[PDB]
Every structure is written in structure tokens, then in C-alpha cells.
Amino acid sequence: MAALAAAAKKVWSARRLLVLLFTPLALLPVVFALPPKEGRCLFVILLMAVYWCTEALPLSVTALLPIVLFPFMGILPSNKVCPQYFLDTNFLFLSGLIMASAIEEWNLHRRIALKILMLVGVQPARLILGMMVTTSFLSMWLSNTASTAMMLPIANAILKSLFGDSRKEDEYRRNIWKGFLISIPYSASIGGTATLTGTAPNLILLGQLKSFFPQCDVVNFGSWFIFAFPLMLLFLLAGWLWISFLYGGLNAEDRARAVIREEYQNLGPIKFAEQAVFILFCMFAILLFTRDPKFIPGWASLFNPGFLSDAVTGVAIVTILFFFPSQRPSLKWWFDFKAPNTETEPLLTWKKAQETVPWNIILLLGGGFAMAKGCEESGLSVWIGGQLHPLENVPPALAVLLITVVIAFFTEFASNTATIIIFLPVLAELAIRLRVHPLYLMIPGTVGCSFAFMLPVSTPPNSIAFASGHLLVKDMVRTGLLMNLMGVLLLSLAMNTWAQTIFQLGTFPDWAD
Amino acid sequence: MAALAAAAKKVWSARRLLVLLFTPLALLPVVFALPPKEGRCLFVILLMAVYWCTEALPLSVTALLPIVLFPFMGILPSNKVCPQYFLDTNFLFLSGLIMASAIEEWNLHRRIALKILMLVGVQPARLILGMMVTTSFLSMWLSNTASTAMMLPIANAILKSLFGDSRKEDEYRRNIWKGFLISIPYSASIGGTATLTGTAPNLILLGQLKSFFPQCDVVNFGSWFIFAFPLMLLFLLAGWLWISFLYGGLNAEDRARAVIREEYQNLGPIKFAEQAVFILFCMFAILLFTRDPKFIPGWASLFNPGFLSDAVTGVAIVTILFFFPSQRPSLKWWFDFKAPNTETEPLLTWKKAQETVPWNIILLLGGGFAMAKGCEESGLSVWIGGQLHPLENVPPALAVLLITVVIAFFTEFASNTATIIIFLPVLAELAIRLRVHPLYLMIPGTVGCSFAFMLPVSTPPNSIAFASGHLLVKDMVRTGLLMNLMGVLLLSLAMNTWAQTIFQLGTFPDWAD
Ligand SMILES: CC(C)CCC[C@@H](C)[C@H]1CC[C@H]2[C@@H]3CC=C4C[C@@H](O)CC[C@]4(C)[C@H]3CC[C@]12C
Ligand SMILES: CC(C)CCC[C@@H](C)[C@H]1CC[C@H]2[C@@H]3CC=C4C[C@@H](O)CC[C@]4(C)[C@H]3CC[C@]12C
Ligand SMILES: CC(C)CCC[C@@H](C)[C@H]1CC[C@H]2[C@@H]3CC=C4C[C@@H](O)CC[C@]4(C)[C@H]3CC[C@]12C
Ligand SMILES: CC(C)CCC[C@@H](C)[C@H]1CC[C@H]2[C@@H]3CC=C4C[C@@H](O)CC[C@]4(C)[C@H]3CC[C@]12C
Ligand SMILES: CC(C)CCC[C@@H](C)[C@H]1CC[C@H]2[C@@H]3CC=C4C[C@@H](O)CC[C@]4(C)[C@H]3CC[C@]12C
Ligand SMILES: CC(C)CCC[C@@H](C)[C@H]1CC[C@H]2[C@@H]3CC=C4C[C@@H](O)CC[C@]4(C)[C@H]3CC[C@]12C
Ligand SMILES: CC(C)CCC[C@@H](C)[C@H]1CC[C@H]2[C@@H]3CC=C4C[C@@H](O)CC[C@]4(C)[C@H]3CC[C@]12C
Ligand SMILES: CC(C)CCC[C@@H](C)[C@H]1CC[C@H]2[C@@H]3CC=C4C[C@@H](O)CC[C@]4(C)[C@H]3CC[C@]12C
Ligand SMILES: CCCCCCCCCCCCCC
Ligand SMILES: CCCCCCCCCCCCCC
Ligand SMILES: CCCCCCCCCCCCCC
Ligand SMILES: CCCCCCCCCCCCCC
């Protein structure tokens, strides 16, 4: 009996190397089964998928696999694979990351968070709502991991202040603890989907769209925002109601108010650098939104068509951060010859940005773009579309529901970015098989790959919440089951009601034929 | 009198913002002077050059200027500028940086350095030669900055041990101190030119070659090595002789021997991880060299022509570092059921690589590639070639000498990478005007932009050496003047004697017409 467990722990200890060395052998029959070029491309894609799901390699290292495999297997030369890793979508990602680094450098995110917490209130339903709104709003511009890791200590402090009898009171307290600790990562994942730069899978959608459908340009920052933000709000409200009912029972209040006000005071007075960063963030968001919202003529019409993009706007805005002074300039300094002549601190130095930008995620997005390019060039997409013939009779709405359910189930065990990278070409080819708009299938998959609620391994925010130690696996599972159901239903509603008007999904686009 | 100095320090305090805001106004007449597209491209290039030379912005931030300026000015759209930042040359750079990070992580560079120092000897001429050989060898694979910063403390310790009378002895000691402290950065800059991954300007040459001359493929790791390594050795020996004559006078020895042996002992026993990293480095170098050396059939002939590259080899080799165990595997562990089952440490984790890879230099190379692409597409290269008509009567050897002198003078005040980025399109167009091989002019410029010897601002290794505090500006200037002269002469000799055979420079290539 003990020997079986011994062999089990032996295999689990070396699972990385075992998976790494046995996955190519297991996937070898794929090469012989399919035509050579398509078979080798499918082998590469499946190997990358397995390595991502098992993290047999670092995710960014696995994302570098196309550069090796595509040239050796003749799918795509080096000078074609390597430039796919810096398409303009990834530079928009870099600009968003730099802006988030500037925001977090000056603690603007903490000031906004504590302000929202003060305005929302302190009642348990209201305080859950404030936590979720804050985390979702901050995850639209910062990473979900950073938003969760910054919001969790504040929630812990407020909960300690609130609770600073017997079975009833202690179980009520415990359920409140769990509700607060589970509302934050859920709301971070919710808010990450509202903006294109909020989460990596949206930018994966953009890049793989550029690869599969080069003439598709209707999805940008403004259109994605006007589609996803109302959906984000509806699902945030549904999650708040569900969590309050499950946990919140849908002098302590004074103590919590005092703690929040005290931490806001500990933030200190508002600085000139914080104001400048806030102004630049507002300019960033507004110029991204108003460049080409597809239903008001944007300022991109004033320039050469087909030249500007969201990446250019983002890079231009974040370039200001690297020379704009962080201390307020004064004209009296020029006249005051006795004043010190120390060099001014800029809003963001490049060293801080470099040490805060997640280059691993940038390389992961690049690997996804390169894999999409290889899948298109090798003809593997045509082969998948040919094999997808049994599903041509599925109604489009039912197809959306099924692919959303499948992707939401898959993302519970793998990272969102890897899941969407693997499933997006299949979604595009399935849209081709149903004669529907490719976005009508690709957008629900991109949104649903972020529906990671049931397990700590589903998404890093879930792991951060679980690290608190007072959340159980079963509690997260039973909350995330209904979270996934409500997310799938709301995604279907959004995709069948107002995504049709925003992305013009009613008719089959010409570039998709 | 004091008022003039006051105004001077006021202007110098705000030189960053003053240059940043007045350079576009100063360069505005360029747009009206030239045809619109070429004029705007020249404006962008000149603005980037000024910002690089003044570091009015961070170098990587200035390298992001094409993404903004080319689309607004209609030179190049976003989807064309942004992919130029990850051409396969930059992935070869990334693989080299990852391999250097792996080497420095396990202190293999220090072990190699101390071993070479023990073998060379301790006599002052021999010890200078050992320091220079060590630094030049380590700079072929590590950055010049890192090599200088690692070699300087060892030189300081050895010098303290050696010297642990009156005017003669103290001036002899001081000249020895200066000779050691100046031989290290010079040798680092010397060795950086020997390999393509040794210094960024070589990879700038590769990328701008890909842009200007897409069909040119004769320059790779093996050909560049066989050209530059003998030139590197000749110039290293000349510099050693010059420095020994200038400074070295071309129980203390026992004490220095003891210190070197003691530090080697302090390195500890050779580890399995160090051996594995050394084996992987040897494989990296050998497979890069033997892939296509252009005069022995390489292993790239076994695959699809035009698909493999040095980037693929580098990425494939460095991928092994991210899963190869750092502790020696044992088959007895499988049978020993009582042994601990801790997960093995790999040779390099992605976190360490990410925090040690200089992403700023990668972005700088990308900005250079994008600027070359914009210069080619805008027609600015044609305009420059048209304006270069007074120089069509210059003999090619004299042209090489003059461009090398000009570039070596310019690099004394600006960074090597920015200098070569700015001057390379001019060199290519000047090669077109003389009906000579483009490499015959482009290679000398790439080599000479690394001839930065006279000032601390010339190259970061010079700044590191000056930070010791016992090197004067005049000493560095008077050593670097003859260093530059010898470098220019040896570069002319190499380019007119054996570069012709290696790169087939005798005849005008068809792709250059
Ligand atoms: C890597 C792990 C986790 C997932 C499983 C991968 C391997 C074992 C699977 C994935 C898809 C499978 C293939 C799917 C279809 C066929 C067609 C036919 O010829 C039977 C075998 C063959 C060729 C299978 C062999 C085994 C296979 C390659
Ligand atoms: C710069 C931002 C952050 C603050 C200033 C106000 C904003 C709302 C301004 C600045 C520039 C403006 C744009 C300038 C030009 C055009 C083109 C015109 O055919 C329609 C309106 C439109 C698209 C404007 C919309 C409003 C706009 C975006
Ligand atoms: C636009 C042109 C004409 C003029 C530009 C003037 C700029 C360069 C001047 C105006 C006011 C100046 C600031 C005034 C006061 C200080 C504080 C002192 O520690 C020096 C830096 C700093 C922060 C100065 C930096 C340079 C500055 C921003
Ligand atoms: C989240 C809650 C509020 C609603 C979720 C229910 C989902 C499944 C419902 C709400 C709206 C529904 C859609 C409304 C209208 C149409 C048009 C019709 O020609 C086909 C079915 C279709 C496309 C429906 C499919 C199912 C649908 C998307
Ligand atoms: C930025 C600093 C450091 C360098 C100098 C840049 C400015 C002042 C220089 C660079 C090249 C110059 C131009 C070179 C040639 C011409 C052609 C003719 O029409 C005379 C003026 C004009 C248009 C010059 C105007 C000034 C100019 C734009
Ligand atoms: C793998 C390395 C580091 C160590 C093993 C020995 C090296 C020298 C071996 C391994 C593979 C070998 C190559 C394999 C195939 C060919 C093609 C043939 O037409 C010429 C020789 C050439 C180009 C070989 C040269 C030597 C070579 C590069
Ligand atoms: C090639 C196939 C058939 C077998 C692969 C076996 C691999 C996975 C085995 C063989 C020897 C093993 C190593 C033996 C000893 C140790 C020390 C212990 O702290 C666990 C990790 C580590 C470092 C093991 C890692 C896994 C390992 C490398
Ligand atoms: C560094 C020391 C040893 C030598 C440096 C002197 C340089 C300037 C000398 C050495 C070799 C010389 C070359 C040797 C042969 C030829 C071929 C002839 O048809 C034109 C001149 C040319 C191309 C010479 C140019 C000048 C040259 C490059
Ligand atoms: C270690 C991770 C990468 C493994 C790559 C294995 C590639 C195997 C290819 C087999 C199919 C083609 C045979 C000619
Ligand atoms: C038919 C042409 C290609 C033949 C070989 C295909 C498989 C190559 C695998 C190389 C793996 C290299 C890992 C470092
Ligand atoms: C009373 C309001 C004072 C505001 C001070 C800070 C202003 C920051 C402006 C930043 C502008 C950035 C784009 C040029
Ligand atoms: C702050 C650094 C970037 C400045 C860019 C200025 C661009 C000016 C362009 C002028 C020529 C075209 C006029 C239509």
C-alpha cells in the first residue's frame, strides 16, 4: 500500500522532466497521421499546449518554442516567426504595462482604491460592493495579480477592525471573511475583461485576429470597451449579489471607517507627480477610446488611414512619463540664482519600468501570435476546418454557449492566456464552418477564458487569495460554479443583444469568406 | 562674471527638457527643405540622433520614437514599424543575453577569469596581458559593462597585494595602477567586437543589413568571428604593448600569486551546474560557428535552405538551460524510496533571466531596425545617395579610412549603438555611390563605432573605470588617441587583406545594384 504512494510521489517529484520528455513521444503519431506540414504544425501546437498546461517549462520559455520548431520543421522561416513577437498589439500591451507601472509607482492606485472604499460605505453588502468595484476598476488598467495583491491587505485590515454569540457569531464572521477574500480575485478577473489592456487574452484575440483575418479592424480599445464594460458591470453585480447571499447574509462600522480614513491619511497629501500621472492616465484612456470608436468619427480620421493604431497612441502617451518632471516646475527658479540646481526627477525612469514590466507576458503574447501565424501558414487551419464538419448543423447561439462552456471549463486548470491561444484558431475555423461572423465565436472564447473562478490554479489572483489560508477549495469551487454559469449566461446575452450592433455581427463579413 | 556662470548652471540643470523641446523646433526646417516623405523621415532620424547623443530621453525610450513618429508622419504604418523590433537578429541577441545570464549566475565567468590569470603569470607585462586577454575573451560573450565591472575588483585586489624609493617608486606604482585600470575597459571594448553577440552594434549591422540589403546573407556568427577575432587579437596585442610602454615600463609576485590562488579557492569546488553551463556554452558557440561558416558546408545544409538562422540555434540552446537540472541526477534516487523528493533546481529560472536580460538594449536594437526600415521605405536612402555625389571620386580604401576616422571620433561622445544606428544607412548609400561592396564600408563603421577609448562618456566601461577615481581624463585621452589610431590602421589592414576573402568583397554584389 505504501509502495504505491511512494511511486506516486516519485513520479510527481519529476513530473516536469517526465512530461517534457514524454510529450514529444506521445504526440509523434500526429505527424504521421496528418499531412506533413499540417501534421508538424499540429505537433508543435499540441506540444506547446501541453507544456503550458503542465508548466513543464516557464510559460515565456514555451512561448519561444515556435522560433525553434517552425524553422526546423519547415513550417515558417526565422525571419517570419521572429517578427510576429512584436506586432503592434504587443506594443499596446507594453504601453499599458508602462502606464500601470507609473500608476503603481506613485501609489495612485492605492489612493483611488481608498477613496472608492470611503465613498461606497461600510455596511457588509455595501463594503463587498465597494471592494469588488474597486478591484474591477483597477484591473481594467493594472494586472489582476497586482490588483488582488494590493486589495487583499486592505480587506484584511478592515475585517480585523470590524471584528476587533459563540457558534452563530463565529460562523457569521467566518463567512464574512471568506466572502471578502473571494470577492477580490473574482472582481479582478471580472474587470480585466472590460478593457483590451486589462488582461492578456484580449490582446491575444487582437493579434490572432491580425493573423487569421488581416482585414478585420472593427475590434479596438473603444469598441471592446463599449461591448465589455456593460457586461463587466452586469456580471460584477451578479457576482456581488451571489457572494453576499452566500456569505454576507443578503461601533464596528465606525472602527472600519476610521481605519479606512486613517490609511488614506497615511497616503499623505496629493503630490504633483500623482496629479500629472492621473492627467496622463485620463489622456491615455480618452485618446484610446476616441481614436476610432466606430460610431463617432475619431481623431484618427485627421491622419493617414491605415497608419495609426492604439499602440501608437499608447506609446506616445507613455513617452511623456519618461520626461515629464515629478516635482512642480516654478518660473521663480530661473530668476533665483541662489536656488539649488539639482536635476529633476521624471515621472517614470526606465529602470523602474524595466524592473516592473512583465516581459514574460509580452513574450507569451508574442509566442501566441507566432503560433497563430504558423497555424495559418502551414494550412493547419484549413485542415481543422475540414475536420470540423460534424458541427456545421449547430445553431450559432448554441455554438456560442457550448464553446463558452468548454473554454470556461478548460481555463479552470490552465492559464487564461494559454487557453485562449490554443482555442482561438479552432474558434475562428468553427465560425467559418457556421457562416457566422468570426467575432461572434472568438469574442465569447476570449471573455470565457477569463472565467477562472473554481480553483487556486485557475488564475494567479485565486492563488493569492488562497495564500491567505482561510479559503477552502470547496468554498471556491461552489462559488465559482455559479460564477461560471452566470458568466456564460451573461456572455451569451451580451453576444446576442448588443455585441451585434457594436461589432456588426448580424451579417457575414466579406473578409471572412 | 558670476552671473554668466549662474546662467550657465541654470541652462545645464534643465538641459534635458531644453534639448527635448528645442530640437524639434531646430529641426523643423528639414521638413520644408526636403521632399515631404523623405524630409519627415530625416526629421525623425535627426531627432532620434540628437536625443540619443544628449540622452534627453532614455535610450530605449528614444528607440520607441519610430512607433510614434512614422505613423503620424505617414512614413510607415504601425503594423510595419512594430514588427521590426523583433527581427531574428534581436532574438539571437536575447539568446546571447540569456546564455550570459546563465554563465554569470553560476560564476563560471569568474572561474574562467581567475584560471586565465593564474596561467598567464604575474610579471607586470604578463599580468597586463592576462587582464586584457581575460577581459577581451569574456566580452565576446558577456557585456562589456559586466566584464569590466567584474574584472576591476580583481585588478584592485592584485594591485593592493603587489604594493602592500619616494618619488621614483611612488610614480612607478601610480603608473602601474593607471595601466591596469585602463587596460580592462579597453580590452572589453576590443573583445566585444570579436563576436556578433559580443556587442550590440554588430547586431545593429545585421538588422540594418536585413533592411537595406535583404538578399545579403554572407555575414553570420562564423564569418564575423573568423574576420574579427584575428583583428581583435592584433589590436589587443597592440594595445597591450602601448599600455605597457606608457605605464608598465616596457615577494610581491608571490603575494599576488597567493591572492589569485586564494580567490580561486574561495570560488569553491567546481559544481555540476557549472560544468553543464560550460558544456552548453561550448555547444552554443560551436553550433553558431559551424552552422554556415561560408567555407565549410555547415549543418544548416541538412535542413530547408533559407529557414534556419543563428537566432534559432541560440534559442534552441538556451531553452535547455530552463529545464536542465543544476544538481547531478542519480539513478539511485529512483530506487531509494526514503530519499527526499524535493523538486530539482534548473540551470536557469526565467525570473533570474528576466531580471538580468537588458531589455533596454533589446528595445534599442529594435528602434535601430525600425529606423532603418523607415529610412529605406521613405526613400530617404535614395535622397542621401543623391546628395553624396561629391564623394564619388574618393578611392575605396581612402573612403574606408575616412569613415572609420569619422565614426571613431563620433563614438567618443555618443553611445556605440546610437552612433552605428545613425551612420549605417549613410555608409550603405556611400558604398552604393562608390560601386564597392556594401560590407566594405559597413563593417569598418560597425567596428569603429566601438573604438571608444578617450572619454569616460564614450562607453560605460570607461565610466566604470573612471569611477575608481585614480584615472585622469588626460591619461585616458592620451592613451585613447593612439588606441584609436592603431584601431583605424588595423581595421583598414583587415578590411583590405582578409575581409575580402571572407566576405567576398572584391566584386560588387548583384543584390547591391
Ligand atoms: C500529451 C498528453 C497529455 C495528451 C495526449 C497526447 C497523445 C497521447 C494523443 C493526442 C492525440 C492522439 C492521436 C489522435 C488520433 C490518432 C489517429 C489514429 O492514428 C489513432 C492514433 C492517433 C494518432 C492518436 C495517437 C495518440 C495522440 C497523439
Ligand atoms: C486630449 C483629451 C484627453 C482631452 C481633450 C478633449 C477631447 C475630448 C478632444 C481632443 C481632440 C478631440 C478630437 C479632435 C478631432 C476630431 C475629428 C472630428 O471630425 C470629430 C471630433 C474629433 C474626433 C475630436 C473629439 C474630441 C477630442 C478627442
Ligand atoms: C518651454 C521653454 C521655453 C522653457 C522650459 C523651462 C523648463 C526646462 C524649466 C521651467 C521650470 C523648471 C523647474 C523649476 C524648478 C525645479 C526645481 C529644481 O530642483 C530644479 C528642477 C526644477 C523641477 C526645474 C526643471 C526645469 C524647468 C521645468
Ligand atoms: C444572463 C441572463 C439575463 C440571460 C442569459 C440567457 C441567454 C442564453 C439568452 C438571453 C438572450 C437570448 C437571445 C435573444 C434573441 C435571440 C435571437 C433568435 O433569433 C435566436 C436566439 C437568440 C440569439 C437568443 C439566444 C439565447 C439568449 C442569448
Ligand atoms: C539639434 C542640434 C543639436 C543640431 C542642429 C540642428 C539644426 C539647427 C540644423 C540641422 C541641419 C540644418 C539645416 C541644413 C540645411 C538647410 C538648408 C537651407 O534651407 C538652409 C537651412 C537648413 C534647413 C538648415 C537649418 C538648420 C538645421 C535644421
Ligand atoms: C554538437 C557539437 C557542439 C559537438 C559535436 C561535434 C560537432 C563538431 C559536429 C556535430 C554535428 C556535425 C555536423 C553534422 C553534419 C554536417 C553536414 C556535412 O555535410 C558536413 C559536416 C557537418 C556540418 C558536421 C560538422 C561537425 C558537427 C558540427
Ligand atoms: C529519460 C526518462 C526515461 C527518465 C528520466 C528520469 C529523470 C526525470 C530523473 C532521473 C534522475 C533524477 C534526479 C535524481 C536525483 C535528484 C535529487 C532529488 O532532490 C530529486 C531531484 C533529482 C535532481 C532528480 C530529478 C529527476 C531525474 C533527473
Ligand atoms: C595596422 C598596420 C599593420 C597596417 C595599416 C596600414 C593600412 C592603411 C594599409 C595596410 C594594407 C594596405 C592595403 C594593401 C593593398 C591594397 C590594394 C591596392 O590595390 C590599393 C590599396 C590597398 C587596399 C592598401 C590600402 C592601405 C592598407 C589597408
Ligand atoms: C524539448 C522540447 C522540444 C522537443 C522537440 C521535439 C521535436 C520532434 C519532432 C518529431 C517530428 C518530426 C520528425 C522528422
Ligand atoms: C522535412 C524537413 C524537416 C525534417 C526534420 C523535422 C524535425 C526537426 C526537429 C528539430 C528539433 C531541434 C531541437 C533543438
Ligand atoms: C489645481 C490643479 C493643479 C494641477 C497640477 C498638475 C498638472 C499636471 C498636468 C500634466 C499634463 C500632462 C500632459 C502635457
Ligand atoms: C517630444 C518628442 C517628440 C516630438 C515630435 C514633434 C513632431 C513635429 C513634426 C513637425 C513636422 C511635421 C508638421 C506637419
Ligand SMILES: CCCCCCCCCCCCCC
Ligand atoms: C501629411 C500627413 C501628416 C501630417 C502631420 C505630420 C506630423 C504629425 C506629428 C504628430 C506628433 C504626435 C506626438 C504625440
Ligand SMILES: CCCCCCCCCCCCCC
Ligand atoms: C567527469 C565529467 C563530468 C561531467 C558532468 C556534467 C555533464 C553536463 C552535460 C550537459 C549536457 C547538455 C546538453 C544535453
Ligand code: NA
Ligand atoms: Na488586469
Ligand code: NA
Ligand atoms: Na485560467
Ligand code: NA
Ligand atoms: Na561584450
Ligand code: NA
Ligand atoms: Na561610444
